[PDB]
Design a protein around this nucleic acid. Structure first.
Ligand code: MN
Ligand code: MN
Ligand code: NA
Ligand code: NA
Length: 327
DNA sequence: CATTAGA
DNA sequence: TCTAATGA
């Protein structure tokens, strides 16, 4: 956690680089389990060899270890850090809609800068066009103060659309957080559940309304169960216009709402920990259900969940407010 | 680990 | 169809 710090961090630097700049899924994968392992180790790695005794740690990495311990640095890390091509890929990759693959191509063609990006809006798809358009707003955190005004608006129209609609802003916001990255609304309807052959309009009606009133301003992707766009709160009686924010609204089979809701509310740890508990308690929890475990090794049979509670109860735990779902 | 775009 | 990119 701090004892193998630099070690794992160097390791991750390297991993990550193999994956984006180079198209070496393997090495990238190598660097990572080793990083993963030296990370667990209970004592201060004092050399290549010591580390070497580890699984995943071979000669190659052990080697990097010494040089890193030896001189507090790594040549390869210095070179890469310098390396313009890779620098570029690392950066282009920041535009929503651009991945490593595309990052490579752009550079290939010689598109290294945001402006390069601009002079060539054409080579870019919609997603990317939008991502470039709000590069600034996308990079900014969402102040909770605003999260409250967004949540406010969203829930209104929702209800005004159909009243039988259930929405929940999930995520960190849900759990207290002063700021959030993007806004995540979990949606459901009674009319939609596990079987009942859908009702796409369900998601559809909603976006339409939000756009209608001018909250959704763009669409990155809109499908039958997961909408992905851009919103913005109404630049007041002017002077202060608001930033463009990322919004994600997803339809849920009413019969899996809370599991989902449970899930997206995180945190990654609480989740795990919670998930880990249901296991002993004779269960299983996944993004949508909670199944009673059977002795044959496994078993199924989706228990009825009506609120975050039921879930709790099932595993016979203390209902935890979102606020304290921290771990 | 699953949903959408896109070519 | 597959392949990329998001998320989470
Ligand atoms: Mn989010
Ligand atoms: Mn999101
Ligand atoms: Na990106
Ligand atoms: Na393949």
């Amino acid at each position: 956690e701090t004892l193998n710090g630099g070690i794992t961090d160097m390791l991750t630097e390297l991993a990550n680089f193999e994956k984006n700049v180079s198209q070496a899924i393997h090495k990238y994968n190598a660097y990572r389990k080793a990083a993963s392992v030296i990370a667990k180790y209970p004592h201060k790695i004092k050399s290549g060899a010591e580390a070497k005794k580890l699984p995943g740690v071979g000669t190659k990495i052990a080697e990097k270890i010494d040089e890193f311990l030896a001189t507090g640095k790594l040549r390869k890390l210095e070179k890469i850090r310098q390396d313009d091509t890779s620098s570029s890929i690392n950066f282009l990759t920041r535009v929503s809609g651009i991945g490593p693959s595309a990052a490579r191509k752009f550079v290939d063609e010689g598109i290294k800068t945001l402006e390069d990006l601009r002079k060539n809006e054409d080579k870019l798809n919609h997603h990317q066009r939008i991502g470039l358009k709000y590069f600034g707003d996308f990079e900014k955190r969402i102040p909770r103060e605003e999260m409250l005004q967004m949540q406010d608006i969203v829930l209104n129209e929702v209800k005004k659309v159909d009243s039988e609609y259930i929405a929940t802003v999930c995520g960190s916001f849900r759990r207290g957080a002063e700021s959030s990255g993007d806004m995540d609304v979990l949606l459901t309807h009674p009319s939609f559940t596990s079987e009942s052959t859908k009702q796409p309009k369900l998601l559809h009606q909603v976006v339409e309304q939000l756009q209608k009133v001018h909250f959704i301003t763009d669409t990155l992707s809109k499908g039958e169960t997961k909408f992905m766009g851009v919103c913005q709160l109404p630049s007041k009686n002017d002077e202060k216009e608001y930033p463009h924010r990322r919004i994600d609204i997803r339809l849920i089979p009413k019969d899996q709402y809370y599991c989902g809701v449970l899930y997206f509310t995180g945190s990654d740890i609480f989740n795990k920990n919670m998930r880990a508990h249901a296991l002993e308690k004779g269960f299983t929890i996944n993004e949508y259900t909670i199944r009673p475990l059977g002795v044959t090794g496994v078993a199924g049979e989706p228990l009825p969940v009506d609120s975050e509670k039921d879930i709790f109860d099932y595993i016979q735990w203390k209902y935890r407010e979102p606020k304290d779902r921290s771990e």
